[PDB]
Amino acid sequence: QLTWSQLPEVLESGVLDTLSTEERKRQEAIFEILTSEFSYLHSLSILVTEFLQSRELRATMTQTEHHHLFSNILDVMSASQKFFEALEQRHKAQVCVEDISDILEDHAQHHFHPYIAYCSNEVYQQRTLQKLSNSNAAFRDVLKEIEKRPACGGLPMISFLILPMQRVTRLPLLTDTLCLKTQGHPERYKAASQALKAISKLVKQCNEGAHKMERTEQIYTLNMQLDFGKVKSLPLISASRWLLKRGELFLLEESSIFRKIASRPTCYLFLFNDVLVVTKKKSEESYLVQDYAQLDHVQVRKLEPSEPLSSSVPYPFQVNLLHNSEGRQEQILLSSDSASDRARWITALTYKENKGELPQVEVTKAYFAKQADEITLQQADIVLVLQEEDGWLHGERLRDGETGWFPESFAHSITSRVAVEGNVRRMERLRV
Template structure:
């Protein structure tokens, strides 16, 4: 009856109420002492109950005690009223003495925030843009940081974590308590750690969903599988060891004094698997293309795996190239730390040494990939050449292909009563030390008609605006005027051919950029030492480009390139800032950098990277 219920509620004694609250507090404390599986659940009851205080210690009170150093023992009223929470308060005081330990802070404060402990909101490395690669990162002001923070809150975009965005840093006001220079240095150090975590997550997806897929493995041979995935598991384990030490250093103190020793140690020893993986790149790309083109079963299973939600609509190739991308970005990340470290500090020299080691690692990776590709290509070309003249020993470990392609050669034939000009197709194989001149019989067969050492070649462009400058005598001016609208001409003088004779050739390329590329490749002097780099245009890459020919440059988004030559039909010849590699790439992949401060900063960075005497 309602009257009984009303009487019963009104008749509750203070003793009964106290017993109920004590029982509830005991049950909550016992449940909280278990693992934090239910840490996110809210507890009922008012703020004065021991259970509510214990819940608060797991969030607000604990954070204040650990971060701000508030002495909760000084609150005598809390001790008297809530004796059951006393052991918990004692634990907080013990932790306060170690408030710099980010490990406990992260477990209690960052749970579910996707910094390092949650993968559901973590950013895959394909979508992670290191701030060190952002050419305007230093111009970023405080108001802009607030804007980025608002973007995270309201749009819920999984952006990369920064040091200043960590809860422990924001709640304690640490970023405001230090100088702007030190804050930038902490950001640069933290970025190495956070980007390694993102990279590790992507590698885990590659291994779990693609490499370990039984269904996918059944569609190809073991050799194809090995060419496709190589030693990616070893690369993953090396990254895990690297990240473990980085995170331990981060856990020891919110302010990371230095990570140069960790980077140097792993770059010189642990990262050996990277060299092997990058060396396999040629076989990897070729195998994947072949499987997709000729194996319907493989293509179907691959498409199904790529649609998995963990892949986030990214193709397998974007996962396979990650080790190459990561290893080439490490020098830039370390260089950024170097840039933010005072030059009179011992840390600066340590950082330079670490930068040298990662640069050496990248050089070994590049050399391994190039050596494998060059060696295979040399044997392939050698098997396709048929010498109609004295044979030339082509295969050599110190020789590699610079450029190959078809050109039109114009030859003057002198008859009994007149002269006439005929044209014929020639196919050039230009190596770093020799030019092989052939006639193409088929896609895989070439007759060698002549050859010359590269040092005996002199190339000269024909000026289309001045037909009289044509290199071929007599009828060449007329020839040039007839052909200039369709063919772009240049002259090649061979000072000594295979027979020791001098000869001249008038050659035509189909496009303006093709002519420029042949002139640059055939020319012995690339103007690299004479040109003042500070006067060159700088461009930032806005779209990834993969080289399709030997004289082209593969580029990643955010790469900076110095432009040596611009051709009106849409091509640049440039030098990659991070490693000094030179080649051609489409203009549409880049945008010009106009900020003077950024240009100067890029030149300083290039000086540091290339000054290590290692071709990154």
């Protein structure tokens, strides 16, 4: 609640009568890194004390599920603690802090490695929590009782578990502000800028580690679930292959003009960065491959409604395989029941095929990706809008360039020319 300029010691010092507005803002920038770190650290200690160290919660699980659920949270808290303590000694000693950029650079270079492992483990933490929630009744009961405890402040365990990912991606935003408010001081601007590069590099290797682990897990899970038995064999395992989109679509057949909305045939698509696989789903864990084609040899287009003078084919489109699993040509006629669904399929299928002029939007509430083509967004994230369709936006996040779909409901336009131009400049400052 109290800002730096409101602290009793700064008021007592009388420094405000002569302090420049830029040095004031720089002290506020330093202060906000300090208070936001403590608030985060305090939340981590609740996670550790109430969940990680719950004997009763460990008894519902195995040692392997506990490792995947909590990972190296103790190392994350310890690095946060040593970082906060360094900052707090600078704040305690002087009314006006000369600098913290050496602390930021040092810890981002030499002490924040546990963030990389924690972020990289996200896929397994999610799968472990899903399985425990779905199939472990004792876990659900103990978890429910812990969350009623006042110490949790009404928040569920999952919101504590993702705090390190949220924290690390906020440090470059806070360090960038500090750089801006340090421009009046030449040698400390250099140090702040070095700090900005170091922290941005750390966030990058966090982001790359989580992507590698999730893609590796998916390629192995899908290599097992996808049955190539009745088509020419296609090794699905690759160190570079990742899933763009998956989902069920209704099969159309142009030989029928009298289509029904009951017992509609389906197929199930797995679209990877370099290959489209067409399947029929046989169970949750098994899809029988019908055909596939290199993405390079896929074309797509919308199909037109029937000529005049309610359609069982609401939003149809057509996929042409120019060179399918037998080296021959095939077409697939598909229908989704949503306009935005069709648009997302077409966008993913044209994956293979100026930034200051793009519309910008600001995220009003957090959004958590539910599908491979969606993007997880934090409140106040800035997003460059690449496409809009039927309540869904396709955007590039400003801070890191991640791209995906999210509901338009979760953001509001930025129309100010000065803000829009400002966000663009912040973009190269932040990008690696």
